Design an enzyme around this catalytic site. Structure first.
Site, PDB file in Angstrom:
ATOM      1  N   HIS A  51      -4.232  -5.884  -3.201  1.00  0.00           N
ATOM      2  CA  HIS A  51      -4.018  -4.463  -3.440  1.00  0.00           C
ATOM      3  C   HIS A  51      -2.550  -4.173  -3.709  1.00  0.00           C
ATOM      4  O   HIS A  51      -2.103  -3.044  -3.560  1.00  0.00           O
ATOM      5  CB  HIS A  51      -4.428  -3.618  -2.235  1.00  0.00           C
ATOM      6  CG  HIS A  51      -5.853  -3.826  -1.771  1.00  0.00           C
ATOM      7  ND1 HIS A  51      -6.246  -4.729  -0.849  1.00  0.00           N
ATOM      8  CD2 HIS A  51      -6.977  -3.136  -2.194  1.00  0.00           C
ATOM      9  CE1 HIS A  51      -7.589  -4.637  -0.678  1.00  0.00           C
ATOM     10  NE2 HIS A  51      -7.987  -3.674  -1.503  1.00  0.00           N
ATOM     11  N   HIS A  79      -9.729  -4.929  -9.015  1.00  0.00           N
ATOM     12  CA  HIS A  79      -9.801  -6.373  -8.797  1.00  0.00           C
ATOM     13  C   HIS A  79     -10.724  -7.051  -9.809  1.00  0.00           C
ATOM     14  O   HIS A  79     -11.039  -8.229  -9.656  1.00  0.00           O
ATOM     15  CB  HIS A  79     -10.288  -6.742  -7.372  1.00  0.00           C
ATOM     16  CG  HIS A  79      -9.657  -5.921  -6.292  1.00  0.00           C
ATOM     17  ND1 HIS A  79      -8.305  -5.948  -6.035  1.00  0.00           N
ATOM     18  CD2 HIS A  79     -10.195  -5.033  -5.420  1.00  0.00           C
ATOM     19  CE1 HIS A  79      -8.031  -5.112  -5.048  1.00  0.00           C
ATOM     20  NE2 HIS A  79      -9.160  -4.540  -4.661  1.00  0.00           N
TER      21      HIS A  79
END
Lengths: 325, 331
Positions: free
Chosen positions: B214, B53
């Site tokens: 995700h 991320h």
């Protein structure tokens, strides 16, 4: 075939210190008050944050952005020169592309005939043609932004147009860049800027998504770093120079992830250490891109003058280089 | 095409960060990256979560922001033991505040570490971000994910802490700020992995609304009808949750977040389209931040986060300079 008007208007909305002049491609530092010599640059859209992210106090006073991968028209370059001009000189950084030279040269000439003292440097850091043995021009690529930062700092600290030109002439030759594409630019309708097999990479790339000079089999990121470093060594010959201190840029070309970029920088930093070099300044990120290309370029620049590290570390108001000491 | 490992802390990426920034130190084999400038004079804030991320949350470690971030393997949060190590390291007996994203795996590890820290006498307090409005927008009985809006907590709590806020006041500020934050995202393309696999299957003419971070498929697949209609959809949904037409206070903070491979040209053009719509809606966006703020590998996608400027001081907090590489801007 259009200036990215919405993107430039969006930049203007986002950053209080930046103002966009509609329909001109000109983005400027609205805090600039003509007390120091202005440095400007520009070029095609599609390389963001080059050069819009380098406009701000201590870096570019203005940047002029053209359509995707096409440099701005000379009339807009001229407009930008006249706007930042106050009779102290204007300094222009141009990337070495025939299209860019044509437009910038025309504006520089016209500006001069009007009484404006315009000086310039042409960025030509790409080593691809030497690394891969071609008789083509040396492209101005990610290492261009070192000129933005160093010349911008020196100007902000009071350097005259003459002194800035001399610094540019000393810096420019020291900058060496080589990049590789891991995947081409993707366009609409499932088209790409060149074809590249999934197990292939393309060494010796520029920034407008053209294929690089040498296709090779992909053998992992470590092997890729070795190749880039090997070719840079062959041009720089750092082993023969007493000064072992370098500035390093690790540049992602668009869709290479930050985790890849920092992993790759770890690799390259270790390789250079094992070469006996000290990297005294590092910048990693999407610094000069080519739309959504995946790839990386490495730039090395000898720290010829310790002051250059001071200039690199000076704070600016430019969105893509706000970092400082 | 060479992402961090799925079974190990991304040690090279983290060390490369440490080598890049003088103010950041990486503690090998722990996933902990810390602000080495931090003096224990103010209440520390920490966060963490899976790798993949970036710049979340390694890009938010620095003076004025997080004192440390603990990063796990790709899309897997850090082990409680390493979170506990980070808590103990930043603790000086003035409290430690932890920002946790609302995912089951993250909650498990962070809760374990916080519980053990408290039994050792450290006043650890936390807020869980839950800004994703996907389940309300698309009508699912699923969790409210913590997503890009989480970084508003890092910035505002970090600034407040830097200015002298006690652990109790920080907690109260967190309780005030967290529920003001509303985020919705859309994927234009899934994560691509090695050997030609994708995180999900998306036709070329399709987009996936209601995504997290995700790489799982969004809640609602729709035909792509142009970027403007994408902004209209996101703003339509955000409107339905926020109901700003009903609020006297029309002042908002906006984040426009690229999920990895969406270009800066696309992001700022999209920001402009969105800002014009919020203008037509009578809103005043008083702070905007645009970029890859919390990504999902090389996913192409955008999330929009809105947050009422409930307290004008919040703009001051947003505008204070930090040492964090992904949020160095200031007034």
């Amino acid at each position: 075939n259009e200036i990215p008007e919405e993107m430039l208007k969006g930049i203007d909305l986002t950053y209080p210190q930046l103002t966009y002049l509609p329909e001109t491609g000109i983005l400027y530092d609205n805090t600039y008050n003509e007390k120091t010599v202005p440095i400007i640059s520009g070029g095609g859209s599609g390389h963001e944050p080059a050069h819009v992210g380098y406009v701000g106090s201590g870096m570019l006073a203005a940047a002029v952005t053209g359509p995707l991968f096409i440099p701005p028209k000379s009339k807009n370059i001229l407009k930008a020169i006249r706007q930042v001009n106050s009779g102290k000189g204007v300094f222009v950084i141009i990337k070495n592309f025939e299209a860019d030279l044509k437009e910038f040269n025309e504006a520089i000439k016209e500006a001069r005939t009007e009484g404006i003292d315009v000086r310039y440097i042409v960025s030509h850091d790409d080593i691809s043609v030497n690394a891969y043995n071609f008789h083509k021009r040396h492209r101005g690529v990610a290492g261009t932004i070192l000129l933005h930062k160093i010349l911008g700092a020196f100007a902000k600290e009071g350097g005259s147009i003459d002194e800035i030109e001399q610094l540019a002439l000393s810096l420019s030759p020291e900058i060496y860049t080589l990049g590789v594409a891991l995947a081409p630019v993707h366009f609409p309708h499932q088209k790409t800027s060149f074809v590249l097999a999934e197990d292939e990479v393309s060494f010796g790339i520029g920034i407008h998504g053209e294929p690089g000079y040498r296709v090779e089999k992909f053998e992992g990121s470590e092997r890729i770093a070795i190749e880039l470093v090997n070719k840079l060594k062959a041009e720089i010959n750092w082993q023969k120079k007493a000064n072992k201190n370098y500035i390093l840029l690790v540049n992602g070309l668009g869709s290479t992830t930050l985790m890849e970029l920092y992993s790759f920088q770890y690799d390259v930093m270790r390789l250079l250490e094992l070469e006996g070099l000290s990297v005294k300044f590092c910048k990693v990120g999407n610094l000069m891109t080519s739309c959504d290309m995946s790839g990386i370029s490495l730039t090395l620049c000898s720290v010829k003058d310790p002051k250059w590290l001071d200039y690199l570390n000076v704070p600016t108001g430019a969105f893509a280089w706000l970092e400082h000491h």
